[PDB]
Design a protein around this nucleic acid. Sequence first.
RNA 1: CGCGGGGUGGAGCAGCCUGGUAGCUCGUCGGGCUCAUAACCCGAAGGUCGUCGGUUCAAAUCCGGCCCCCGCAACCA
RNA 2: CACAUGUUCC
RNA 3: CGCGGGGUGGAGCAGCCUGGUAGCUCGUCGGGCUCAUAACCCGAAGGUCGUCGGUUCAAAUCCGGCCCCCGCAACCA
RNA 4: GUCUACGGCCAUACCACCCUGAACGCGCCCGAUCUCGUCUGAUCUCGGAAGCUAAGCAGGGUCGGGCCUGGUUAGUACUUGGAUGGGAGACCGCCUGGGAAUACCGGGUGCUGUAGGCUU
RNA 5: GCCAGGUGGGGAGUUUGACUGGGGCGGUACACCUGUCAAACGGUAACGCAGGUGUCCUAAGGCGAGCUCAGGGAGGACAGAAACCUCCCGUGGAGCAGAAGGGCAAAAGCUCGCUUGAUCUUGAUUUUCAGUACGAAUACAGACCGUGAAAGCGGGGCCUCACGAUCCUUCUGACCUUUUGGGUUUUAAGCAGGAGGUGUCAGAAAAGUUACCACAGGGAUAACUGGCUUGUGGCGGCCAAGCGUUCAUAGCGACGUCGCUUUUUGAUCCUUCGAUGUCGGCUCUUCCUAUCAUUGUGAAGCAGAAUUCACCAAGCGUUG
RNA 6: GCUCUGAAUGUCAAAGUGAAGAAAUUCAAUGAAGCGCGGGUAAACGGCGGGAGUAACUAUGACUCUCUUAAGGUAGCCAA
RNA 7: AUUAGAGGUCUUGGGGCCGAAACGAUCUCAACCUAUUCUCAAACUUUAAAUGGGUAAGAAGCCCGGCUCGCUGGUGUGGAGCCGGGCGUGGAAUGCGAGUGCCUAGUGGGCCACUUUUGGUAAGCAGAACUGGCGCUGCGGGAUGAACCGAACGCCGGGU
Lengths: 205, 293, 104, 159
Amino acid sequence: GRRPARCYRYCKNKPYPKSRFCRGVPDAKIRIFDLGRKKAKVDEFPLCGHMVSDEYEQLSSEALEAARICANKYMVKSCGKDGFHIRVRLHPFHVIRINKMLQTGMRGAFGKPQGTVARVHIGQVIMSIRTKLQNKEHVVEALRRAKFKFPGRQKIHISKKWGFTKFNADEFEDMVAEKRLIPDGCGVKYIPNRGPLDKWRALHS
Amino acid sequence: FVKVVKNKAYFKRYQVKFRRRREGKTDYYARKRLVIQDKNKYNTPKYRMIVRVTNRDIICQIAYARIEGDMIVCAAYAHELPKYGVKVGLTNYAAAYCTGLLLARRLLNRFGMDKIYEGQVEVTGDEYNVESIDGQPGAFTCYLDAGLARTTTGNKVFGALKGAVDGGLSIPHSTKRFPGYDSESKEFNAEVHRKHIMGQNVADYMRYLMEEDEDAYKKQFSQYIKNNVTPDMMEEMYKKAHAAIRENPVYEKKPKREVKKKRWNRPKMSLAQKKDRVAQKKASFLRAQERAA
Amino acid sequence: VNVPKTRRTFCKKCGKHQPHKVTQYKKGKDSLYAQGKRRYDRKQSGYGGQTKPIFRKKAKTTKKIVLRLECVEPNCRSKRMLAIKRCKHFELGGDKKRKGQVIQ
Amino acid sequence: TNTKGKRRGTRYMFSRPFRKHGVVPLATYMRIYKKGDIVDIKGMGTVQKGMPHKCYHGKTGRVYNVTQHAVGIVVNKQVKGKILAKRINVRIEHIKHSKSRDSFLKRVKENDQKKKEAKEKGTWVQLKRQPAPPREAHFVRTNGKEPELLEPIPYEFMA
RNA sequence: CGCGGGGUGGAGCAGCCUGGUAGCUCGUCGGGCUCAUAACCCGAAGGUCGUCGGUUCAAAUCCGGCCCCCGCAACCA
RNA sequence: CACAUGUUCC
RNA sequence: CGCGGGGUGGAGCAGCCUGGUAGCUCGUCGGGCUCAUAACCCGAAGGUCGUCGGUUCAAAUCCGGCCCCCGCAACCA
RNA sequence: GUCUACGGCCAUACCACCCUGAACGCGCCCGAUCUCGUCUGAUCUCGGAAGCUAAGCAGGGUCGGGCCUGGUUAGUACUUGGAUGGGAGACCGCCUGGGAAUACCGGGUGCUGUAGGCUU
RNA sequence: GCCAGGUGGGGAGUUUGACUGGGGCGGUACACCUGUCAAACGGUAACGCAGGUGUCCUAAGGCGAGCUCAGGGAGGACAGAAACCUCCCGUGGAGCAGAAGGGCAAAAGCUCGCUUGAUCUUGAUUUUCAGUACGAAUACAGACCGUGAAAGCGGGGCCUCACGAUCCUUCUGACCUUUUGGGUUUUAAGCAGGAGGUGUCAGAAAAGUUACCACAGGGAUAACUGGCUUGUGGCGGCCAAGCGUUCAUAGCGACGUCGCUUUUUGAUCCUUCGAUGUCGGCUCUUCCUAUCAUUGUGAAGCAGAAUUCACCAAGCGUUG
RNA sequence: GCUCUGAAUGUCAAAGUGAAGAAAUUCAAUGAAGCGCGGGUAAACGGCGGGAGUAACUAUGACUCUCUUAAGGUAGCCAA
RNA sequence: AUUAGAGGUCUUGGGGCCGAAACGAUCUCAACCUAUUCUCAAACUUUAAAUGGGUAAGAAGCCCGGCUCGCUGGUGUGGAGCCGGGCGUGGAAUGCGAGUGCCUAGUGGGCCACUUUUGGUAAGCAGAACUGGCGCUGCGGGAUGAACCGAACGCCGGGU
């Protein structure tokens, strides 16, 4: 198989992404980042939970793949099959190297691309879940089952933003009241007071 | 559909060219070679003869380059000619030779080099070059600034140039582009150039329209009949016009009369109006929205 | 590369630009009575074998083409050498290539 | 190791700035340079000829020889524990009049002005620049209002 | 593991080095000969050169990764 | 100059 | 580097000499033949005579230089 | 007030659409005998002045795009120097100094040199 | 007898590169170039990374003029996804010999016209640098020329790479100097400028083998222990999808993840090359527990038997 | 490798030969053995193939096709 | 480089459906386009620090007056070079005497640490940048120790 994750744990090297120079990189084991009822509007899932990291380490694409399923599986039993929506907010882009041995030793030891990993900073969201507000403890347990699939420690925080928006939940409805936020399906378009005037006529009609 | 070419990112990267290039008025590839001076000359000005042709005028200026904007030392126009002797036809080849003469004579009269450097009084149309005279002040030297005009043989930017070199300026040039240089056998013919300088090609057009058709003649040379310019007095008109320039080429500015201080233009709007036009516009939208409902 | 068989260049003897004929330079036959050759043979004569180095590590797969100019004036009659950069193929007065014409 | 190319590592040193590519303004040419002017070097990529080396991009020197399109500069180059006053020939395009000198030339004007002036007054006025002193004793009026009390805020985990 | 060559109609091989534009034997199919089959005679079909992307006016050919197959080597204690 | 072979209940 | 002899129908080859004549064999194609591929025969299609220049009433031929191959002999940057 | 010629700075000057342009000017526009150049007088060259602001152009407008300039992001990010500071480490906190960038929210939308007109 | 040519490991002499995570094998990191590394001047290493070079060009050199590219949309007889024609949009998304980077829009691109500045000759300077060369390059100056109406531009390629000493040979240069006691004339030697090349690229003329081996040395340098490391090997946890008829955890346990251990092999080269005797077995001792048996016990999918799992525990055994 | 053959001969040294030149010198011709060409030879050194298909079920391949070299390992013998 | 839905139109199309058949219509599913949205870049970048690199802070400078020139020229123009004369409050802070020439040994195996940093799973590994150490160096402290912390040394008394 592959090496233990203790080996490629620290953000040791410069970011070495799959490019014109690093070719022949295997596909990342995580391919599906979003799942659940991702075709859901912004006004039925007000609650949003986070798994914010607390270390400057590298999370493998397999840990991202493994933790996704375990958080997905627990939310299926708890909140039905369509009572939530899960975003993995880390995309593995750093390529790790393997110095495969077959005797050469260390003469010309520039490794071959082994797999792909994801570098994460302190206080950065790893994986976030939107759902109905009454299923509060269901998510905070689901992310707890996801912490055991990652190295090191990370906190579980419930954001104050409405859904996956960047707008605070308390200010949300009053902005939808004065038509400051136009629901664009899974997201929402922020309308400023700066465009040409005719489109302001459009929204008010 | 198609990917929108002029999108927001297209303007974010866009680098405009120079203003005088954005209007098609300056060839900076040619201007750089024209107006800059060699650095071991140190503010020795590089005078250039700016000859410009329009639809109804010819502008011949002389200028040297400066960092705050190149400075006009002396100018001349085509419409200064009806003061001397040229009633109509102020854009033909014979008009250019006058303006180049009027520019050259006015300049040396301003540098006190009128009594010296007479030039070519009797117009002939061959190679003339004013060699400097020892002891006396050296001859003035400048360069032609053609611009974006295609410099083919007989172009009127070379006509005014001829008027200048006969006036006494030592402009380096040659006879490949004058009206009368043979293209195929590669030699000059001074007699043919004399015709165009004295406007004879127009007379041979007007004499061509006597036996052919009067109606087109009464439409092609309308102001020529309004000023009675027959093909018999044309050579002796410019010949008289050349004398009347070489005796008093000074310019006399019109009196700057007191203006009444008004505004035809339209004044720009203040912010308080723009911010209130939309406040009226927004109010007038909703108050027209409650009527129909 | 292709050079014309004639060129108008500076003639050292006639002191200005003049048409020259252009031919390729060739090694003359090594004389048997040069200084270095007479010295070399007096070293080889007798025993001891080879006494001077024989070069063997040939590395450059080319030469420098030289051009032997000739002044074509009936009284100048001066020749001079002129060299160009290294090239493998080289001909005198090859047919002048055309712009935009069908190729097959 | 590295290569000894002339332009090795000048991907951003000679590149034109953003939205400034193209033909160069003509006042960069019609600017004059006498002998002995404090002149600095800033290589310009658009003009390939007459370019200086990359070790002078930033260095400032003085002119000692002026040709048609170029000047000779006497610039200092540190080479392994010694300074060399070496002469380089650079075109005008890679050249600016350094303003690191004229503010002293401005100071010479007033120093010559305030020495002739106020001499007939019989007074002695300061000429040398003194560094920024400690500020003098002064009052602070706090009319009516009371200074607002500050407090360190509690912790709100923002993520 | 590193390196070397190879992959072209159903089969086995050219052509590749040196760019245009595809062959050889066999086999298959149809018609004939014979009572008949094979041989034999006539005529046709069948790949577009491992795969993908590049260079070039033009690429089986030149160049690059990938896929399969094979070989050499891998020694001194 | 060459030409191999054979389906058999009655 | 020196000497020799090669280069030519599509492959090969003759003719170059002691100059005005570019042909033969194989291969493609039509005919006649044979049960038949064949054998045999006839006809047509097939050549800047490696490249240039000199010189001739005429040069693939003679004279100089270049290019490719082969044989032997040479060998101080 | 403004324009033409030549410019400097090179978007506060650009781009899209709409409106109005007195006078001069710039243009459009009418023609090809001569000069010159094309397949073609469209362009280039040349000769003009019947018409016209329709356009170019100028001024203006747009809760305009861009650009320019501030605020905010933020004393955040990062960083010089210091410790027998913390932590298993990863990394963090403090002392001493310096200090950013998007999103977001504002303001702005050419200045000007020389010469010459027009408004006399 | 004396010369000449062939042959000649029978015999003689001598050589059989360097770099290098030991040497060999393989590479070329040995002369150069672009990006990066490189830590915002410059400089900066590794058998670091991604590439390139030993060329090509009578124009792909030099001027001047005229042009606008890629790509896309809408149109037009055959004509189609793609032939040609026209309009519109088009900041470069094209092109400029090549690697990459930089640069470039009335051009450095494309297309025409005329051409040889790719010529002749002093120095100064830059780059590598010892502040030596060679190469390459920049500013001039003196000539002779090209082009252009002219200002100007050009002494090769838009810039960064495409190359080479002494000695020798060869060719060109002059009404040249010397050739020996003088003169003439060949010849030869000089002076100057090119070329013939050393790629181990500041430049020897060079194949093996040694287990029959020798000497000088080296722990700067391998094969053994021992150290640091633990990839690998071994051993053990956490989460718990599932297996276990049913039932997550009696016993197991995927996807992941956290360690430990030095009884595996690696990596490394620190110690030893004026020597530490380098495989096993035999013999004999003691130690460790990650427990096979035995003593005492817990838990089972423990009815009894037999067998699993775990705890205290290395006292005593573990054979022919 | 070895050996045999030859003015039927391409190349080659000294010397001799001929010519040009004031002469050194140059050039041309001629020019041995050996090599090249052509035979012989393996109880001389040595060497002695690859890919598909095919038999009453299977397996197998006597036969077949093809590419191929100077020959393609025959008689024998074998995890010695 | 990359994730997700939205809104568009037949902009081409995949099987479709009443339609012979129609951008007539059908739910669509695709790409395509337009506003958005998640995540990145040693060999990407509009922006962009900290630290850092030049230069300047006078007497060799200023300001007058006049000559010389074959250079430069509309123009004793331009520039350069000469003379002559006049101006010291010495034109930032701090510190310190400098300049200069010969002759020249040893060395040219280095090693360690904070911070930055390349390869490597890592290493008391290999390779660099900056500064200081060790080597060449004792002393007090860290039990012990080439490098850590303090502090550098003539021989002694007192104090700290």
